[PDB]
Structure 1
């Protein structure tokens, strides 16, 4: 069985490169971040523009939702993160402490913590309520490309241009495991047993966290320059989804590693993809020659 993702909506509005798209956990919204210093909120199902959220002084590299879909966090070149009330569009907290661009961010499942990764080579853990930095992890020896909490928030996985993926005990900040090309993206599988890692040699790899071994390798896409998001699609067939520097969305069969679909339409690097939490829907977003978000729907 292969998916049949077809274009449903093109979301225009950003005036520079889109950096990240994420579906709200309740499935209602897509959030987009951009080099244009803005967050935009869109209807997940009708693609309808809802609102612009502004306040960062420089471009945004990443955005992430709280578990209840009420808050966003953004990571910016202004060296801050901002926590946003999505309903009001208001900045609740500015998280200050990184000494260079903040590149990546995520809430834990409880959504009492935010993890961030920075060009300053550190991973920070922040208290959402106070906006204060709880821990600074001397995580890497080059810019941090991705940070992600596992299913219960007990672990953080980080990746870096230093070629390392590290797994951190959230509660203590201690490194549990180091899992040489630059690692441009990492995240835990929904069940937290696997880590998906991108390297800037046109390769995605599925790792068994507990055993520390590579189970699957996905190739055929172009990825030598940008930190391109990748996803587990789990609503229908079990796919791996990624953007690509050849302007396509790549979908692989997770088990067989065969490319099952390439989605055409973007006119620049597909930097970010997201999979809808309940429906067979993909969001894709592209760099500055395109600047659009596309919503795609499949029957499986």
Structure 2
């Protein structure tokens, strides 16, 4: 059982914090906010490093390149931006979506970016040029999450249409849809570290681990509240194998991956915890909360 304890609260943003992500090298935390800013913080001391600005509206998500040198951000302004973290300089503005961009991620090789939008499309972008290479519009309602698998060969997307789709990156063609029964809106998805499974959240207060190839659900995690916001979830692998998610009751839940038992609830936030991230090497969680809170918290555990 882990024993995460609060180490720091980070109160830079003036609005809802939308997303927190650790750099793959472990040094930095990036945060994004409805206040149009990205902030960079020291991962270990929570020390503010810089503000990155340029988006004309609220930011929904940020993601790191594999070498921790680049960020991409997804904005209500209908754009993504590629940034050089050292300079704070917008290298490229990705134009093409026709409504709010909600989610983004680089592939492992970090030559591509994938995005999803309220406009119901997934796009693949060239990082060097900033050109849209493909538009994948099969979803019939907003896209909530997009993720590359461990070698970049697949993308998974989640939608309010109630499907997850698996896409072949090279062709753009959809290989698989996961339609489970009732298909409540899907609010989050990503691939497991081993690439064989997908963790999906639905707005019926449920997280499921899916063997996507076989279309069968291995695990379900419940006890939290998730019926309105698109709350991120994580695999914690540095100590014990856990699933980490925020909750609309203002707590961070941590589940045993295998048993599905709630092992810990992190108390502290004063609004919905919309985002959580797990440090790549250390037992550290960052959580971020909505308008009545506007803070990031860093938590640390012995396992």
Tell me the TM-score normalized by structure 2: 0.98
What whole-Å deviation, never above 9, does each CA across 1:183-239 have from its counterpart, x for those lacking one? Answer: 000000011111000000000000012222100000000000000000000000000
Question: Separation in 2 of the partners of 1:191 and 1:9?
Answer: 31
Question: Separation in 2 of the partners of 1:234 and 1:12?
Answer: 28
RMSD: 0.4
> Number of residue pairs matched?
299
| Residue 139 of structure 1: how far off its partner (Å) | 3.0
| Residue 28 of structure 1: how far off its partner (Å) | 0.3
What whole-Å deviation, never above 9, does each CA across 1:8-31 have from its counterpart, x for those lacking one? Answer: 010111000000000000000000
| Residue 90 of structure 1: how far off its partner (Å) | 0.3
What corresponds to 2:221 in structure 1?
218
Q: Per the alignment, in what secondary structure is the counterpart of residue 214 of structure 1? A: strand
Q: Per the alignment, in what secondary structure is the counterpart of residue 173 of structure 1? A: coil
Question: Separation in 1 of the partners of 2:148 and 2:134?
Answer: 15
What corresponds to 1:296 in structure 2?
299
What whole-Å deviation, never above 9, does each CA across 1:123-156 have from its counterpart, x for those lacking one? Answer: 0000000000000001300000000000000000
Question: Separation in 2 of the partners of 1:65 and 1:13?
Answer: 20
Q: Per the alignment, in what secondary structure is the counterpart of residue 51 of structure 2? A: strand
Question: Separation in 2 of the partners of 1:217 and 1:109?
Answer: 28
Question: Separation in 1 of the partners of 2:193 and 2:212?
Answer: 13
Question: Separation in 2 of the partners of 1:152 and 1:283?
Answer: 26
Question: Separation in 2 of the partners of 1:295 and 1:229?
Answer: 16
Question: Separation in 1 of the partners of 2:141 and 2:90?
Answer: 30
Question: Separation in 2 of the partners of 1:233 and 1:173?
Answer: 30
What whole-Å deviation, never above 9, does each CA across 1:233-278 have from its counterpart, x for those lacking one? Answer: 0000000000000000000000000000000000000000000000
Alignment of 1:246-261 (within 5 A): 246-261=249-264
Question: Separation in 1 of the partners of 2:212 and 2:163?
Answer: 14
Question: Separation in 1 of the partners of 2:83 and 2:227?
Answer: 33
Question: Separation in 1 of the partners of 2:190 and 2:10?
Answer: 26
Question: Separation in 1 of the partners of 2:152 and 2:301?
Answer: 31
Q: Per the alignment, in what secondary structure is the counterpart of residue 289 of structure 1? A: coil
Q: Per the alignment, in what secondary structure is the counterpart of residue 276 of structure 2? A: strand
Q: Per the alignment, in what secondary structure is the counterpart of residue 2 of structure 2? A: coil
Runs of 4+ in structure 1 deviating by more than 4 angstroms, as ranges, are none
Q: Which moved more, 1:214-223 or 1:204-213?
A: 204-213
Question: Separation in 2 of the partners of 1:212 and 1:73?
Answer: 31
Question: Separation in 2 of the partners of 1:294 and 1:46?
Answer: 11
For structure 1, which runs of at least 5 residues remain unmatched after alignment?
none
Question: Separation in 1 of the partners of 2:212 and 2:47?
Answer: 39
Question: Separation in 2 of the partners of 1:276 and 1:139?
Answer: 34
Question: Separation in 1 of the partners of 2:95 and 2:136?
Answer: 15
What corresponds to 2:153 in structure 1?
154
For structure 2, which runs of at least 5 residues remain unmatched after alignment?
none
| Residue 167 of structure 1: how far off its partner (Å) | 0.2
Question: Separation in 2 of the partners of 1:230 and 1:139?
Answer: 24
